[PDB]
């Protein structure tokens, strides 16, 4: 049997995927505005709870486009449990944490 | 001094081929990156 | 306009969280169903 399977098993290489970005910013600190500006959209949606966006990243060297996960988290400690929802042990080593700090206040 | 001048004329001969090998490197960067975006199974013997 | 009902939750964030939970379930299964199926593409990568 196999053979077909084992020769299939020798996949040549891989491109990075499945990264993740987290954040906090106080309620309405333009954090949604920034995140939506990164992928180019003028504005997303200002809501409550954990939100979710993209980062389309393109490399001309690899000629590759990838979607980097963005988990923008709203303010208020009442949603702290969603962070238990927003991180796994396997997700941890692939997570880049951005913060927000507006100088309005 | 014969040995030194032999080495010198050898490296001078190398001087010309320097640029040819440079453009060889560039075009192979071209071809290799293309073959990657052409997604070919670079052999195990393939020298990176 | 009123944006506080989430803290006005009778049952606490659980009803929200379980909702999100369904999400993470569906998509997870979906990618699983994709993954093995997607595996077939490997056939091209291995030339005759």
Curated annotation (Swiss-Prot), chain A:
Instruction: State the signal peptide span.
Output: none
Residues binding ATP are: 25-32
Q: Where in the cell is it found?
A: Cytoplasm, Cytoskeleton
What is known about what this protein does?
Answer: Acts as one of several non-catalytic accessory components of the cytoplasmic dynein 1 complex that are thought to be involved in linking dynein to cargos and to adapter proteins that regulate dynein function. Cytoplasmic dynein 1 acts as a motor for the intracellular retrograde motility of vesicles and organelles along microtubules. May play a role in binding dynein to membranous organelles or chromosomes.
**Family per similarity comment:** Belongs to the dynein light intermediate chain family.
Query: Subunit details for this protein?
Result: Homodimer. The cytoplasmic dynein 1 complex consists of two catalytic heavy chains (HCs) and a number of non-catalytic subunits presented by intermediate chains (ICs), light intermediate chains (LICs) and light chains (LCs); the composition seems to vary in respect to the IC, LIC and LC composition. The heavy chain homodimer serves as a scaffold for the probable homodimeric assembly of the respective non-catalytic subunits. The ICs and LICs bind directly to the HC dimer and the LCs assemble on the IC dimer. Interacts with DYNC1H1; DYNC1LI1 and DYNC1LI2 bind mutually exclusive to DYNC1H.
Q: How is this protein named in the record? A: Cytoplasmic dynein 1 light intermediate chain 2
User: Could you tell me which species this protein originates from?
Assistant: Homo sapiens
What is the gene name?
DYNC1LI2
Q: Which residues of the full protein are shown?
A: 37 to 141 of 492
UniProtKB/Swiss-Prot annotation, chain B:
Q: Which residues of the full protein are shown?
A: 1163 to 1210 of 4646
Location of the protein in the cell: Cytoplasm, Cytoskeleton
Per the UniProt record, the lineage of the source organism begins with: Eukaryota, Metazoa, Chordata, Craniata, Vertebrata
Its domain of life reads Eukaryota
Regions crossing the membrane: none
Q: Which family does it belong to?
A: Belongs to the dynein heavy chain family.
Q: How does it assemble?
A: Homodimer. The cytoplasmic dynein 1 complex consists of two catalytic heavy chains (HCs) and a number of non-catalytic subunits presented by intermediate chains (ICs), light intermediate chains (LICs) and light chains (LCs); the composition seems to vary in respect to the IC, LIC and LC composition. The heavy chain homodimer serves as a scaffold for the probable homodimeric assembly of the respective non-catalytic subunits. The ICs and LICs bind directly to the HC dimer and dynein LCs assemble on the IC dimer. Interacts with DYNC1LI1; DYNC1LI1 and DYNC1LI2 bind mutually exclusive to DYNC1H1.
Q: Disease linkage in the record?
A: Charcot-Marie-Tooth disease, axonal, type 2O: An axonal form of Charcot-Marie-Tooth disease, a disorder of the peripheral nervous system, characterized by progressive weakness and atrophy, initially of the peroneal muscles and later of the distal muscles of the arms. Charcot-Marie-Tooth disease is classified in two main groups on the basis of electrophysiologic properties and histopathology: primary peripheral demyelinating neuropathies (designated CMT1 when they are dominantly inherited) and primary peripheral axonal neuropathies (CMT2). Cortical dysplasia, complex, with other brain malformations 13: An autosomal dominant disorder characterized by global developmental delay with impaired intellectual development. Some patients show signs of peripheral neuropathy, such as abnormal gait and hyporeflexia. CDCBM13 is associated with variable neuronal migration defects resulting in cortical malformations.
Curated annotation (Swiss-Prot), chain C:
The organism's place on the tree of life at top rank:
Eukaryota
Oligomeric state and interaction partners are given as: Homodimer. The cytoplasmic dynein 1 complex consists of two catalytic heavy chains (HCs) and a number of non-catalytic subunits presented by intermediate chains (ICs), light intermediate chains (LICs) and light chains (LCs); the composition seems to vary in respect to the IC, LIC and LC composition. The heavy chain homodimer serves as a scaffold for the probable homodimeric assembly of the respective non-catalytic subunits. The ICs and LICs bind directly to the HC dimer and dynein LCs assemble on the IC dimer. Interacts with DYNC1LI1; DYNC1LI1 and DYNC1LI2 bind mutually exclusive to DYNC1H1.
* Compartments (UniProt record): Cytoplasm, Cytoskeleton
Domain remark from Swiss-Prot or TrEMBL: Dynein heavy chains probably consist of an N-terminal stem (which binds cargo and interacts with other dynein components), and the head or motor domain. The motor contains six tandemly-linked AAA domains in the head, which form a ring. A stalk-like structure (formed by two of the coiled coil domains) protrudes between AAA 4 and AAA 5 and terminates in a microtubule-binding site. A seventh domain may also contribute to this ring; it is not clear whether the N-terminus or the C-terminus forms this extra domain.
What this chain does, per the entry, is described as: Cytoplasmic dynein 1 acts as a motor for the intracellular retrograde motility of vesicles and organelles along microtubules. Dynein has ATPase activity; the force-producing power stroke is thought to occur on release of ADP. Plays a role in mitotic spindle assembly and metaphase plate congression.
Recorded protein name is: Cytoplasmic dynein 1 heavy chain 1
Q: Which family does it belong to?
A: Belongs to the dynein heavy chain family.
């Amino acid at each position: 049997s196999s053979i077909l399977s084992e020769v299939s098993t020798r996949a040549r290489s891989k491109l990075p995927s499945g990264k993740n970005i987290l954040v906090f910013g106080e309620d309405g600190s333009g954090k949604t505005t920034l995140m939506t500006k990164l992928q180019g959209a003028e504005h997303g949606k200002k809501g409550r709870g954990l939100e979710y966006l993209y980062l389309s990243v393109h490399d001309e060297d690899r000629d590759d486009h990838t979607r980097c996960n963005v988990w923008i988290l709203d303010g208020d400690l009442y949603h702290k449990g969603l962070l238990k929802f927003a991180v796994s042990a396997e997700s941890l080593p692939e997570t880049l944490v951005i913060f927000v700090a507006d100088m309005s206040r | 001094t014969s040995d030194a001048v032999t080495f010198i004329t050898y490296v001078q001969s190398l001087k010309r081929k320097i640029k040819q090998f440079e453009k060889q490197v560039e075009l192979y960067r071209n071809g290799q990156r293309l073959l990657e975006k052409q997604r070919f199974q670079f052999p195990p013997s393939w020298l990176y | 306009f009123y944006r506080n009902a989430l803290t006005r939750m009778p049952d606490g964030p659980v009803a929200l969280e379980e909702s999100y939970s369904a999400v993470m379930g569906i998509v997870s299964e979906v990618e699983q169903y994709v993954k093995v199926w997607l595996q077939y593409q490997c056939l091209w990568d291995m030339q005759a």
